[PDB]
């Protein structure tokens, strides 16, 4: 089946490099990482506030990394500033969920946030996520058969960023062309990569899985001063 | 709105 054309290799390299440059604690993440003390994040008898205090502490550096990723894509950088904002409020949760889920550790049953905080499913649920925690932990459990490398995670992140779907976009058509460049280059890479899994229809279902994870901004949402202001801006 | 997200984009 068709493999990347020369312009898509250029594309793949650029997107991949954007991702490695912005992934927290890069390759050390499983060594720098520390497990949240397990007294934190138990069932209240609403929301545990101590778990919640830690998650607002790391949300802002995490949102920031996603912004660093899109700004390393020439395709994103030539959009009007208003469009980049709309695109960025729409994919931020999605992309952070993806990067947390590729950092699933079954020996521990934890995802790693910011390259340093290993968190169990119960901690993340009781810190405020609720059912969205089970959603993210399901993605990471199901992704371990897919064996995604840096470029596949990077192209995923590119498909989610370039969503002409989001409301308020001036350059809807332009945004739809960039995503098709990525979508094509992603498949051609999947072909060449020859995963031993009906790979690609399944991967497209995982994209939907993330968009659902993203569409729960409102079914997620403690006083508003308790949220970091950068978090308030993208939710 | 979005006064800080705007700043990070033009940084
Ligand atoms: C979903 C995800 N992810 C990450 C993350 O670091 N992902 C790994 C990475 O991007 O490298 C976070 O740091 C999060 C922090 C908070 C969060 O919700 C909450 C936000 C405010 C209060 C409680 C939970 C979801 C996160």
Residue numbers in the entry:
A (entry chain A): 211 to 255, 263 to 414, 416 to 439, 446 to 459
B (entry chain C): 741 to 751
What does the original paper state about this entry?
As expected, the native ligand T3 abolished or substantially diminished the transcriptional activity of four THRβ mutants associated with thyroid hormone resistance, V264D, H435L, R438H, and R438W, respectively (Wakasaki et al., 2016, Nomura et al., 1996, Sabet and Pallotta, 2011, Narumi et al., 2010). Surprisingly, the treatment of roxadustat either enhanced or retained the transcriptional activity of these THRβ mutants, all leading to higher induced transcriptional activity than those of T3. Although all four mutant residues are located in the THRβ LBD, H435 is the only one that directly contacts ligands T3 or roxadustat, whereas the rest of the mutant residues are located outside the ligand-binding pocket, not in the range to form intimate contacts with the ligands, which makes us wonder how these mutants influence the ligand binding. To unravel the molecular basis for the RTH of the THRβ mutants and further their beneficial susceptibility to roxadustat, we performed structural studies on the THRβ mutants complexed with roxadustat. The structural analysis further revealed an apparent conformational change of residue H435 on helix 10 of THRβ for all four mutants, resulting in the loss of a critical hydrogen bond between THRβ and a critical hydroxy group of T3, which is also conserved for the other THR ligands identified so far, explaining the severely reduced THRβ activity by T3. Specifically, in addition to the direct mutation of H435 to the hydrophobic leucine of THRβ H435L, the allosteric conformational changes of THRβ H435 were coupled with several intermediate structural changes, predominantly in helix 10, which were initiated by mutants R438H, R438W, or V264D, consequently leading to impaired T3 binding.
The thyroid hormone receptors (THRs) are nuclear hormone receptors regulated by endogenous thyroid hormones, including the inactive prohormone thyroxine (T4) and the bioactive hormone 3,3′,5-triiodothyronine (T3), which are critical for development regulation and metabolic homeostasis. As ligand-regulated nuclear receptors, THRs have a structurally conserved LBD that allows the binding of distinct ligands (Burris et al., 2013). Following the ligand binding, the function of THRs is mediated through the selective recruitment or release of specific coregulators, like the family of steroid receptor coactivators (SRCs) (Li et al., 2003, Jin and Li, 2010, Savkur and Burris, 2004), as a heterodimeric complex with retinoid X receptor (RXR) (Putcha et al., 2012, Kojetin et al., 2015, Mangelsdorf and Evans, 1995). Although the defects in any of the processes in thyroid hormone transport and synthesis can all contribute to RTH, in most cases the disorder involves defective thyroid hormone receptors, resulting in reduced T3 binding and disruptive thyroid hormone signaling.
